Amino acid sequence: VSPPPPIADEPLTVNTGIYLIESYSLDDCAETFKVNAFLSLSWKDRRLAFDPVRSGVRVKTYEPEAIWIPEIRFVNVENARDADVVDISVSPDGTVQYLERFSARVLSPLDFRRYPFDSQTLHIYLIVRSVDTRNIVLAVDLEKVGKNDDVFLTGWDIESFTAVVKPANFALEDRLESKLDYQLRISRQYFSYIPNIILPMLFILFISWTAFWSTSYEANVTLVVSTLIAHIAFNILVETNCPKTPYMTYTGAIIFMIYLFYFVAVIEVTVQHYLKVESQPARAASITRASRIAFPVVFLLANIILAFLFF
Amino acid sequence: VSPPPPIADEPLTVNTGIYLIESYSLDDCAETFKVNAFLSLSWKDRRLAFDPVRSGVRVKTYEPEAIWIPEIRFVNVENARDADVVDISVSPDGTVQYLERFSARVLSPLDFRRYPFDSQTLHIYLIVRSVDTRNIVLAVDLEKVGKNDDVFLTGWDIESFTAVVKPANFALEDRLESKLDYQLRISRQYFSYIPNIILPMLFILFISWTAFWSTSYEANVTLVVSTLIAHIAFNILVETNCPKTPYMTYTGAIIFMIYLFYFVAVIEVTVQHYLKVESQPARAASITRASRIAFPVVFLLANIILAFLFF
Amino acid sequence: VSPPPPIADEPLTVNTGIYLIESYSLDDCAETFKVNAFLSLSWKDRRLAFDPVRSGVRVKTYEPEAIWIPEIRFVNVENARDADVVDISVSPDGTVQYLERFSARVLSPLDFRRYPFDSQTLHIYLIVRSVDTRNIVLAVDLEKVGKNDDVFLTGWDIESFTAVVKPANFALEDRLESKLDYQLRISRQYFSYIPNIILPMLFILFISWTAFWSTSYEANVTLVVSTLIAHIAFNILVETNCPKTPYMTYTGAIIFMIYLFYFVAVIEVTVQHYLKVESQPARAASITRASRIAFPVVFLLANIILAFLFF
Amino acid sequence: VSPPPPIADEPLTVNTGIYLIESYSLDDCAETFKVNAFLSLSWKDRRLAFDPVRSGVRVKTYEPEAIWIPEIRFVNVENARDADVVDISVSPDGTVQYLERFSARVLSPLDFRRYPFDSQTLHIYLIVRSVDTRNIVLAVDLEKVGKNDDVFLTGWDIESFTAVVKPANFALEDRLESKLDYQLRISRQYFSYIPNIILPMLFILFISWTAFWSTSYEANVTLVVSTLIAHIAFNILVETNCPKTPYMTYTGAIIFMIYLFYFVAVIEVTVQHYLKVESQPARAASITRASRIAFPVVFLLANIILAFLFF
Amino acid sequence: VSPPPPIADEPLTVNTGIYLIESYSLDDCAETFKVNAFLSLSWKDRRLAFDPVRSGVRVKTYEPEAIWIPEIRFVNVENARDADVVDISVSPDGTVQYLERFSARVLSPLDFRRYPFDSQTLHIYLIVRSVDTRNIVLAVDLEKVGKNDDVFLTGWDIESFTAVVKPANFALEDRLESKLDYQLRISRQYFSYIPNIILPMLFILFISWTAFWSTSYEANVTLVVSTLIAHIAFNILVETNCPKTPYMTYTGAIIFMIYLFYFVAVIEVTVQHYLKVESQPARAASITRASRIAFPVVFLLANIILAFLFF
Ligand SMILES: [Cl-]
Ligand SMILES: [Cl-]
Ligand SMILES: [Cl-]
Ligand SMILES: [Cl-]
Ligand SMILES: [Cl-]
Ligand code: NA
């Protein structure tokens, strides 16, 4: 089999559609997600045309091997998609209706800057390479683009599944490629992060601030250091959940800034003790009394500034 | 091969049955489980009919390629099922009896709200897409739906395996699709969670309450902070075991509430020390004495409340 | 190809044999193990009979596709076995000698009650489904059942590999099934658990009991809490190694009971301090002196009871 | 099919090109990366030559099985590449133009000496084995070597993708082989390591130095020991991120040297206490006062020497 | 196709050779390694013989399906090798020269007794089973056994790749099996273990010994218990790197023995405090003074004994 010939010099229009059946495995570290969907292809092959009155059959059904099917591939897949042809139907005028069910691991980058209050636009790129005989061009049949209502992605809210109707036609290795952009819009469900990471992290910090109502250096040292470790435990836990970035993330900024607070609290605790030993507890008392107000305020204002910069 | 033609205008009824041989790999985080079962299919194809007298056989055995077999797929599978045809039998009246043994990774959401005292309904959705020639509809042959007695799912009690007899018929890309719902009812074996997570977590909490019978700030600080840390160790362990959720879980609520108890115990320990230093140990004594009763009671009442809200 | 015909009304006897080449990957959490073995099959197909005079050769060699082969499957495999036909030999009378080399992940439950002093019986179930023409029945050729001397399973002692000679014939989905039980007997190598988990865990426990020869509440609180924490560290480690169970395990019982010891040691340490503060160190001295003897004994006695209940 | 025959005694020149579509999964521990690219091959096969006049076609398309294709393999792949033929075009002189899309896991060693400030040269080796008929030699068509602009590798900056134009021709198992070296130049994005590992690690060390402004042995012991533990937590985190090497890495050297600082700080803390107990706090005061300056300087100096040796 | 017939009653000699292209993924816990190599097979088939002068062609090239190839398998592979035939060449005399490129996961046990100063002998066993017609016997063509210079195995030094020239001929399931032993000799690169595990572990132990120059029970309890904890962290870390063994390993012995040192240090710290409280600090002073010398010596002597027993 060879491609359908052009009537006039026109490129072949392959109408495409992706219908999500399942979405799963959004790997933050790998910046990948798995998808199970219908891929619909539609193109006119005049060689396949027939008479409905005399043939008595409105639609003719073919096996993939029997006819010419355009070689459609995904740009951003890890391995080539696992596909199973559902149906091939030919209308009397020779319009072909291809339908396959596929599953693929899609590689699409994520912006972690606003984590865990981030939204993402996942991409699925369809592509066709033009043949020497004729040029192939992709189009979106919006009728055949959608998703099942039950499509869920654990820890995410699925906003929309749409296609950018205008293909990106360009030359690659002295031939035309026609690229389509399917978009899955999702927003992270930040709920869990509040009682699991954010609040426990704030409690340990506040516990270290009780050192401002204590004169016991040994006690204070213990408070600050111990709380500090725990901060370390949470900080590390996050790095694991997260992917390394060449930029700062929201949570990353909060976590880093909290380290400075522990460092300064240690300084205060050290200073207060030094003065007490040097028999000048009145200076020490002033610093400790200032610290009781300053820390919460600065910590609080600093957070405000950060949230402003990030949102 | 093409589908059996309709006598009158009727849709084709494909009788289905799933018999579980093996159940395994219930991944809580992935919300998936693996299954190994028999899939039985039965439909009438008049073109295949014969006379037992003329033929000298009361049954006819075909190879998949030889006859028309309905394209049955699973909706909620990760990848398309691994299937091996066991047998295809034809009765003299053109009644086809298809049997395959398959294995598949089924994606079915879980409700973690009552963890680890939760029960789940796992779903296996069978589907058939109608062809241009005729409409296909699924039915349940309850005689061919079951499970082996030895079917086990590690850390779960297998309640039942049943099918919702009435299919969910609907349009998808202008073709009728017949969807069937097979249900595997399971309930979690919470036993382990008592000596592994629940009791150790209560012991560390109770140990922090011994600070209410001590005047040593340094000793008290150590008691609360250390225990808090251990609680942190346990709190983190759970999140690894359990998926991030946009709702609170039972264990999650208990764990979060316990953080508040440590926070308040630190406040009490701080308050008691402050008064002792300000040469007013009679006030301190009252608060500490109140704390000894108040803590256990409030803790206990709060759990009662939570259990009420969750069950 | 169809099944061979009966010469009287008899069922077809398929003689089986499994010879283990390799056993590996015993996953305790998954309750699975991987196996690499020879599967030998023998049945008689009179339709394949030949005169060595005419054919030239005393034994004929066929390709699987060329002749009828009984559909033998494994019941308890995760996915269908990876098999490669080593040889298919036919003797003049039509006796077929089938040899394949396969590899499979077998799902077989484990009893953790006596961990790490447990022994297991791993099962490999062979099965055949009878056809409408004739009934198929499995048999064990004990001459072809065995294992290589070099067969090892990391962290386990391989006791025996035997077959239960009598098949389990039963009806399933209105057809007969002939099931065979191959057994791999193994016992855990508990050696490692002594210097890795058991002894370090006892040392930390005994370190806490040194609080019985101290009057320093602050030092005691450190000893008991710190050591307690370490126990926690070990406790979790086990849980990672082990599977959640609906029953208590030996190690699990020891670990849980040790928590009670820390809890009571904290009580003693609290009690002793309270009395010392209430200016009654003679009562405190009696309790501490009793504790020095009571603890080891009770701990010791308790272990005895536990070992008795478990073995 | 057999190889094209030599006109004169010349070896067959196969022109090659690799165009990266996707690069992902750079595993530091495994020293591997996954790639998805176009592989282009071009050679002259006179047997396939045709006259455009009598044929009426400027090009001819063939199925892989129909013609002779040189057996090109990758040297450094884990498993043989997953390839799909995109197009095979024959020009009138019999110049074959082959194009496949492949995906492969490439094994290429990494130099960790400058981690996380290291750059790497990833290699992809193309190879062809010469046949008994004629010698096969590889060449680079620089017009067909490149990468998509959107090619990204998480946590790395992609510098260049080039080919060493001159093949490495040599003998292997008594046949000549033509080897080509494709190079992917990348440099690590060290950004993250600063707020995640480097800075937290410096803060904990500096906190240990507050012991130089304290006379409380118990507070100092706690300060150093605790901080030391945190370092330990960070040290372990790294060796998990980072592969074991037979050489020292930059971060590894910093981490190891920091251990010496804790060890010496413990000695100082011990010495200072010993003197204080021996009723000679003037000596102790001198050592502590020296330590306040010495540590930062030595630490600071030590780093310069290290950074110098490593860069 | 059937096997080549014997001229005289001789068994068929299949000359073998394995040439390592790549060696990777040495999994200590799994006791496996992955290999990518050339497998060469050479045997003589008189049915395939031809005339050089008459034919004009020195060598004839066949497709695997066209001729008889001996069924060579690997004994110790997890799954059957992924093989791709590179070339089949027939000499006039009928000597066939087969060459495939394969990749396989080899299961070969490891001796951890001297870890991390251990050397291993990895095995690759080639096997052939005889047919009813004639007996097949393997031989090593040392000219075709080797490895690429660039073959590396992360964290290991590759010593040699050799073959035991004489096969192990034996009967299994009433047929001859000819087994060959290919050996990959490797020695572990212990460098990393010194600054990563060994030295940090010694530093924490020396820090515990500073308790011998302190009279502060509270400080000593902290020193010994904390450091002890750190030791635990390292001990556990090692357990993750290593596999459970039925024997003691070198590192395992060092780690276990170090626990005894902490246990005895706690006893000393307890004893010293008890005497101080009983108003007898002169006895306490003697024990502490003895301990300072004794611990290093015994620690040092015991280590010597251990190294002697292990090497
Ligand atoms: Cl694709
Ligand atoms: Cl399916
Ligand atoms: Cl099977
Ligand atoms: Cl390849
Ligand atoms: Cl093999
Ligand atoms: Na302390």
Swiss-Prot record, chains A, B, C, D, E:
Its main location: membrane. The keyword Transmembrane applies. InterPro entries: GABAA/Glycine_rcpt, Neur_chan_lig-bd, Neur_chan_lig-bd_sf, Neur_channel, Neuro-gated_channel_TM_sf, Neuro_actylchol_rec. Pfam families: Neur_chan_LBD. Changing E218A: Decreases cation selectivity. Decreases the binding affinity of TEA and TBA. Nearly abolishes block by Cd(2+). The chain crosses the membrane at residues 190-212, 216-240, 249-277, 281-311. GO terms for cellular component: plasma membrane. Changing E218 to Q/D: Decreases binding affinity of TBA. It is found in: Cell inner membrane. Keywords: Cell inner membrane, Cell membrane, Ion channel, Ion transport, Ligand-gated ion channel, Membrane, Potassium, Potassium channel, Potassium transport, Receptor, Signal, Sodium, Sodium channel, Sodium transport, Transmembrane, Transmembrane helix, Transport. Residues 1-189, 241-248 are periplasmic. Changing T251A: Marked gain of function, with a ten-fold shift of the proton dose-response curve towards lower concentrations. Also shows slower apparent rate constants for activation and deactivation. One of its GO terms (molecular function) is extracellular ligand-gated monoatomic ion channel activity. SUPFAM superfamilies: Neurotransmitter-gated ion-channel transmembrane pore (SSF90112), Nicotinic receptor ligand binding domain-like (SSF63712). It is a multi-pass membrane protein. Residues 213-215, 278-280 are cytoplasmic. Tetraethylammonium (TEA) and tetrabutylammonium (TBA) inhibit the proton-activated currents in a dose- and voltage-dependent manner in vitro, whereas the blocker of acid sensing ion channels, amiloride, has no effect. Channel current of GLIC can be inhibited by inhaled and intravenous general anesthetics at and below concentrations used clinically. Ion conduction is also inhibited by lidocaine and by divalent transition metal ions such as cadmium ions. Belongs to the ligand-gated ion channel (TC 1.A.9) family. Consists of an N-terminal ligand-binding domain that encloses a wide aqueous vestibule and a transmembrane domain that forms a narrow channel. The homologous nature of GLIC to eukaryotic nicotinic acetylcholine receptors and other eukaryotic pentameric ligand-gated ion channels, and its sensitivity to general anesthetics, define GLIC as a structural and functional model of signal transduction in the nervous system, also relevant for exploring the molecular basis of anesthetic action. Cationic channel with similar permeabilities for Na(+) and K(+), that is activated by an increase of the proton concentration on the extracellular side. Displays no permeability for chloride ions. Shows slow kinetics of activation, no desensitization and a single channel conductance of 8 pS. Might contribute to adaptation to external pH change. Homopentamer. This is Proton-gated ion channel.
